[PDB]
Amino acid sequence: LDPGLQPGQFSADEAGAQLFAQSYQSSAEQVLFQSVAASWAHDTNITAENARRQEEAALLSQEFAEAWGQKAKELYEPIWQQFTDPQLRRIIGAVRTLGSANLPLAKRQQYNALLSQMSRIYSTAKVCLTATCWSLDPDLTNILASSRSYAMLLFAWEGWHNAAGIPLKPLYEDFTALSNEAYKQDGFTDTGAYWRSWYNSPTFEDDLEHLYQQLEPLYLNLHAFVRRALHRRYGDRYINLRGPIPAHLLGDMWAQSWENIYDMVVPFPDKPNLDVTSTMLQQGWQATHMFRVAEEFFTSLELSPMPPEFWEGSMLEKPADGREVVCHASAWDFYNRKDFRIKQCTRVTMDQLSTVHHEMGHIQYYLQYKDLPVSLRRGANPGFHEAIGDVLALSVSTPEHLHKIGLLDRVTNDTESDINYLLKMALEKIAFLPFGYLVDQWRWGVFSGRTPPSRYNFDWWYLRTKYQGICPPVTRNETHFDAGAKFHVPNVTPYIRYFVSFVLQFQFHEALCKEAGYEGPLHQCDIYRSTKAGAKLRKVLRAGSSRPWQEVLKDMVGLDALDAQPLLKYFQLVTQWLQEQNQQNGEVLGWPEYQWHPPLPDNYPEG
Ligand SMILES: *[C@@H]1O[C@H](CO[C@@H]2O[C@@H](C)[C@@H](O)[C@@H](O)[C@@H]2O)[C@@H](O[C@@H]2O[C@H](CO)[C@@H](O[C@@H]3O[C@H](CO)[C@@H](O)[C@H](O)[C@@H]3O)[C@H](O)[C@H]2NC(C)=O)[C@H](O)[C@H]1NC(C)=O
Numbered sequence: 001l002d003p004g005l006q007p008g009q010f011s012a013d014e015a016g017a018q019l020f021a022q023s024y025q026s027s028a029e030q031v032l033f034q035s036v037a038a039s040w041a042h043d044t045n046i047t048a049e050n051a052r053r054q055e056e057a058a059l060l061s062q063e064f065a066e067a068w069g070q071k072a073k074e075l076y077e078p079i080w081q082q083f084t085d086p087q088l089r090r091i092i093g094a095v096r097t098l099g100s101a102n103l104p105l106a107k108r109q110q111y112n113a114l115l116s117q118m119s120r121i122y123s124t125a126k127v128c129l130t131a132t133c134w135s136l137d138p139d140l141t142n143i144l145a146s147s148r149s150y151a152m153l154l155f156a157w158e159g160w161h162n163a164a165g166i167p168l169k170p171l172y173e174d175f176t177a178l179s180n181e182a183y184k185q186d187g188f189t190d191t192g193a194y195w196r197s198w199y200n201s202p203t204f205e206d207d208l209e210h211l212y213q214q215l216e217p218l219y220l221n222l223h224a225f226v227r228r229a230l231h232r233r234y235g236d237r238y239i240n241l242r243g244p245i246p247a248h249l250l251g252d253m254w255a256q257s258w259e260n261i262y263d264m265v266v267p268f269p270d271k272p273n274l275d276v277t278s279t280m281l282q283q284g285w286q287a288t289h290m291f292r293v294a295e296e297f298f299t300s301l302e303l304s305p306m307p308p309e310f311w312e313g314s315m316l317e318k319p320a321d322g323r324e325v326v327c328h329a330s331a332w333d334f335y336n337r338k339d340f341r342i343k344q345c346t347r348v349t350m351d352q353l354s355t356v357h358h359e360m361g362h363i364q365y366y367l368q369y370k371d372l373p374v375s376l377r378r379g380a381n382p383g384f385h386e387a388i389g390d391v392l393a394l395s396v397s398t399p400e401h402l403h404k405i406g407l408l409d410r411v412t413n414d415t416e417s418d419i420n421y422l423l424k425m426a427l428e429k430i431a432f433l434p435f436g437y438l439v440d441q442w443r444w445g446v447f448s449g450r451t452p453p454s455r456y457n458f459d460w461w462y463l464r465t466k467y468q469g470i471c472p473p474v475t476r477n478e479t480h481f482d483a484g485a486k487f488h489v490p491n492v493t494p495y496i497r498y499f500v501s502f503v504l505q506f507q508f509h510e511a512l513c514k515e516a517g518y519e520g521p522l523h524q525c526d527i528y529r530s531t532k533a534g535a536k537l538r539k540v541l542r543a544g545s546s547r548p549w550q551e552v553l554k555d556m557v558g559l560d561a562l563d564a565q566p567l568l569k570y571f572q573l574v575t576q577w578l579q580e581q582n583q584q585n586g587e588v589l590g591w592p593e594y595q596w597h598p599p600l601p602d603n604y605p606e607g
Pocket residue numbers: 400413414415418519520521524
């Protein structure tokens with residue numbers, strides 16, 4: 001380990017602590033860069049060596065956090081909570097939380113090594129038919145999004161969940177135990193309590209539950225409307241109009257957003273096709289076009305363009321050489337104020353264009369706070385980081401903006417078109433809310449011990465049925481580990497940030513649309529080229545995590561807390577139209593036949 005990274009001696013008061021933080025931030029950048037660098041080398045090129053090197057960097061990060069956490073505890077443990085500087089209090093409190101650095105060396109290794117193997121299992125798992133084999137991205141993704149054959153969707157869903165989940169379960173149990181051991185020594189009951197602490201809100205869970213209560217009626221009506229369409233397509237044998245929807249029919253491996261079945265549920269298919277994918281292909285869009293168009297939206301707001309290091313270093317397409325990569329999209333900050341990259345196996349589709357904006361939102365954030373000290377190089381909270389790119393994508397997806405960028409012949413500003421659009425947006429945003437809420441409900445119960453290995457799948461499907469109103473299309477038992485077939489579980493990425501951001505982004509949109517001078521319906525707003533909006537947004541991004549998110553938020557939108565009303569205001573028209581459609585069809589809202597599962601196809605898996 002480098003002496004130049006080990007902590008110096010500082011006076012045991014706030015003045016010495018202010019110098020202590022500078023020296024910490026100084027050396028942390030070198031440590032963070034070598035960790036990010038090695039993760040990148042592995043994720044863009046999965047090999048045992050790159051895994052080894054990634055784990056060495058992880059160990060080194062842990063030695064660094066140990067030394068500096070120790071020093072901080074011996075110097076300021078009794079006095080840092082009383083400092084006047086609140087940003088210093090933030091920094092110090094962070095440094096004294098050692099996480100996996102609380103582990104002994106032998107368990108530090110095992111922990112670092114589980115992450116490598118869980119990541120490899122997920123990102124290299126394949127579904128084989130009988131020579132060739134399908135990967136999740138693009139093969140199974142495209143099947144789930146476009147196939148309307150019940151048996152083919154089933155084969156892809158079952159094959160994926162079996163291939164990814166079953167091998168992960170034994171590893172995930174070991175990881176959970178080690179993670180908990182680590183964070184207990186920081187004073188957390190369990191890792192989940194640490195994750196939740198990032199929101200600095202004593203009533204976090206209660207506040208989330210109250211939000212979900214306001215949003216659930218919207219989901220239930222969307223659910224019932226979509227269920228009716230699936231009933232017509234697949235028959236009474238496979239769809240129960242009073243039961244949960246089979247989990248493989250909603251356009252997505254995790255049933256988590258439904259925009260890919262828009263063409264099965266669009267009420268007015270004569271009107272312009274608001275899925276512009278066919279046009280993007282007809283026009284010959286490529287990955288680089290998509291990132292350049294996203295970039296230009298950011299620069300239209302007088303935010304920063306992507307630096308040369310981004311274009312030279314990013315991986316914007318799935319490699320064609322015989323290489324295995326983590327295709328799950330990600331945005332990378334190397335903590336050197338120079339290098340920022342996206343790794344995305346970009347496909348030419350409309351929902352990938354949204355993803356491009358999402359990931360570039362992360363980069364923009366990185367660029368706007370790169371001069372802050374490291375500990376503040378985060379979103380106000382993790383939900384803020386996830387909302388930035390999605391907010392811009394709300395403007396991009398409006399039919400008026402799509403027209404501006406040549407992807408849609410201008411649509412009539414009528415009601416059939418307004419409903420078509422808000423419905424597509426509901427499929428993308430409202431359908432996600434139960435899933436965004438339930439994933440960390442599951443993981444919080446695993447970390448707390450409420451959900452032992454013996455109930456991993458039982459409790460996962462309890463939650464999936466409770467919240468999303470779906471059911472597995474084949475029988476599952478505790479040999480299956482269906483939570484593990486979702487990227488964020490083996491890759492240990494928390495999820496509640498996405499529930500937070502799916503609500504928050506509509507608060508941001510409203511603030512920015514009002515600040516842009518817009519006045520029509522909130523869902524037709526396009527903040528493109530509004531430099532006033534760009535300024536309001538730029539203030540948030542530069543704040544990093546220096547001020548409480550409740551303060552940053554108050555400055556931007558007028559409230560200091562999450563609020564569903566902007567979301568509700570955005571969807572008002574289709575919320576009403578959906579209720580009417582379901583009443584006219586005599587739908588039951590919900591899934592009272594909660595035990596119901598569909599039958600197998602006759603010749604399955606044959607033919
Ligand atoms: C599309 O058309 C709407 C008109 O609203 C329509 O309502 C239904 C009957 C259907 O025809 C729908 O297809 C359609 O949405 C336009 O919305 C209207 O825009 C004007 C000016 O932009 C708004 O005036 C403002 O109103 C606010 C709120 O009162 C005031 O604070 C302002 O001072 C200003 O006077 C008007 O309110 C707004 N109406 C509604 C219901 O939102 C929309 O602009 C138009 N868009 C496009 C792209 O053509």
